Assembly symmetry: D2
Homo-oligomer: 258 residues x 4
């Protein structure tokens, strides 16, 4: 069974990576960073984000595993001291799948897959877009930007904006506002919105058509934008589970105490 390991790049992560590779060598494991079936991330949730996007074209044949060399992450939920215990079991577990968010941009198409969220800002000018939900004009948003988050991504940027945390077993997506203007003439919903599967949220410009669109940690500028389309992707990320680590326990350890 093929595998590969990505490292944060610091001294602790590179050394932990070489010790796991040496451990897998004692088994029948084959290192292959081209067509792997097991992808291990050593570092933080940001390193795991990079590992996910390096193989988003083969998500159905890959089970991800995360190791946090710093603090407890949501995707990297393995202690460095438990690395050798992980090498044995990984060489012969069950698979756990999380939903993902699809982002489509159209000009005068480009699709992206997000694990945390996808946000839209205005390249310098004021951000004004009309929010269309299933071909129905819902609101004209006026403010800093908007954030569409996955279930597992609600603990990231979505949380800082006031969004709700939702369990990853729910196939849904959540949209939250960034510093919206609300006076007697400009009105937005304010509340976060949770959309189920097969619901399409479209963002359409009003004046400016240049938007700073981000997907997870990748932020790239798009010029002459006609529409930004959001929907829950049909593809899912697969994790390799070896023990019981509930999502609500991960939330407790990351935010309450540990």
């Amino acid at each position: 069974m093929k595998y590969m390991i990505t490292s944060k790049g610091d001294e602790k992560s590179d050394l932990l990576r070489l010790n796991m590779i040496a451990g897998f060598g004692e088994y029948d494991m084959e290192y292959d960073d081209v067509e792997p079936e097991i992808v291990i991330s050593i570092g933080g949730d940001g390193t795991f984000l990079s590992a996910f996007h390096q193989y988003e074209e083969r998500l159905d044949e890959i089970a991800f595993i995360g190791i946090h060399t710093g603090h407890l992450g949501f995707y990297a939920d393995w202690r460095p001291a438990e690395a050798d215990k992980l090498v044995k079991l990984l060489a012969k577990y069950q698979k756990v799948s999380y939903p993902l968010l699809k982002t489509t941009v159209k000009y005068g198409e480009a699709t992206y897959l997000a694990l945390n969220e996808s946000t839209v800002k205005s390249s310098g000018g004021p951000f004004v877009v009309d929010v269309v939900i299933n071909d129905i004009h819902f609101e004209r948003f006026r403010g800093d930007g908007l954030c569409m988050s996955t279930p597992s991504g609600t603990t990231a940027y979505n949380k800082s904006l006031g969004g709700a945390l939702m369990h990853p077993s729910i196939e849904a997506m959540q949209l939250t506002e960034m510093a919206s203007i609300n006076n007697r003439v400009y009105r937005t919903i304010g509340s976060p919105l949770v959309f189920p599967k097969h619901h399409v949220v479209s963002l359409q410009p009003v004046n400016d058509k240049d938007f700073q669109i981000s997907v997870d940690h990748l932020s790239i500028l798009h010029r002459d934008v006609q529409e930004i389309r959001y929907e829950v992707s049909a593809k899912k990320i697969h994790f390799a589970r070896f023990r019981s680590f509930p999502f609500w326990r991960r939330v407790h350890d990351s935010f309450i105490e540990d």
Copy 2:
């Protein structure tokens, strides 16, 4: 097919009720407020709430219809001028189901069914409870109270507390905080929490065991409480749909403009 009609009690609602009853008399409809299969509510969402709780023992044999004599409600989504058009079609539509919230209270059991939400406060003293999620201690809440809302109830009390609006096709429940205390020694999650089906949220006392527990508009005091249990109910409320009125359009008309 049996039916019944509840009225808000004012002049406009009582007159609209008698005109619909006379219209149903022209068909083969039988008025029966004991074992009805069609329950019509004329007034507001509060009147619809009363109509739901009067027949929560026969939810699987009843399709609800709401008429708003005041402003546009979420459950009463029919104009009074469309009443006669409603009488004809209702006498020979499709059924639409929404999930519900189950509330269990234990002393030293009482179950309730909520359409909007179920909240917990403290009878006078300070409100302190431990929040347990699937037999896991998540947080010790310290503040005014807590609110567990249904999907269709997220537009009510849940919205005023900062909760997210979620589409009723999602079988889930959402918990939100009321004026929580957060300093260097008392810590809550703050964010709203969305729980899927088969997840159990338990509230357990610390000192005071008397709580002011509410279900929709019913508020009753409970003494010597041992545990408050929350989970998505297996029973669903059934609406009779005659036209396309999306939930996100109901949200737009109630909060954006109409």
Copy 3:
């Protein structure tokens, strides 16, 4: 110079109280709980709140001192181990004054002095009041209640409701909302409001005239209420300062780390 000491009532506070009284006996200090000029509070901010209200008729002749036997409080900012050091200096310091909030209730008058805040709720029914600012109708509030806080009280209940923290050198008062309803027909400002000196905020009923009015920790029901009047009081509480303990440092220790 006369003095008195109030205790939380537990073992640690009562013992610390008797040791300070014995220390003051070694000086020319006279214990008098009737007409004191120095009032020491041993326990928490709640105990300090009680000590303030026991002598609100002689605020101009009393300098308050707080000792926290538990965690760091905002009004009780002295460690128990620093008690003997406090007894010496207190027997021959400078005075520091904080503004207070005045609350007037009228029926068919009763004035109260608050150190933290004064809140208004509805005795069971829904809470609806019109908010009048300097004889100008500002908004019709619809929700759980309202909270008018002093500058030093903004770190208490006001903080849990989203209010801003303001330095006690600012003679002002801050009003915050409790779970307000905001749809297309009911509209409140939502933002907290900071009022300067000589500004009068009046609350007037709409239907129900019975309100659960609270002042600091005292909560008492009022029937047949005509108006609730708010303004910054002309009286100030006086603290005895012996060292530099800035307000922003007290906020840091209570909420960031310590």
Copy 4:
């Protein structure tokens, strides 16, 4: 008495400007856009913002007047139909002063005067700064940015971020957070902070020293930044008042109804 008039540039504003200039010609008024003593703004609060910054070097000799050709603004509080009535009285009123915010940037100094607010973001990377209040380390902020607002500016960007509205008679400044990160290891105060006169709020970098600093509508990038200093300015903007238009009425008309 010298005067000048700035226009939004559209057809309605330019025509209203030429009609007022012709009206002032019938009096002893002298048009001078170099050393004026009366500055009239015709358009919106953005146009008024431009008019303020064009003459921030002569604030003590200038009384500002605003005219809104669109909707009711906070600084432009005169209807276009009341223009001729304004020309007569302005040619022989009382002066009203509002406080301002001072912003100092230091490299390896540049001072700015803000009427609404001054915000700090990170030029691309993550925004991390230490917040120092009167030479005391208060918090290490981690998020999108920070916003320091004037009293009259609290109805603008400060409001969208959750800040409190404060009456302009209070000489103070208010700081609010933008999408802060708060987990078990990163902690900010969250609440808005209101600082009185003579209090200094300093922002110091951690890693990145390039910041996108904005003052009102001007946004300019600063490289190799050592410190960002905030304090209530000693200079005040002067308005020419002809009638009673309370601040709380301006808030009502802009946000509640009009």
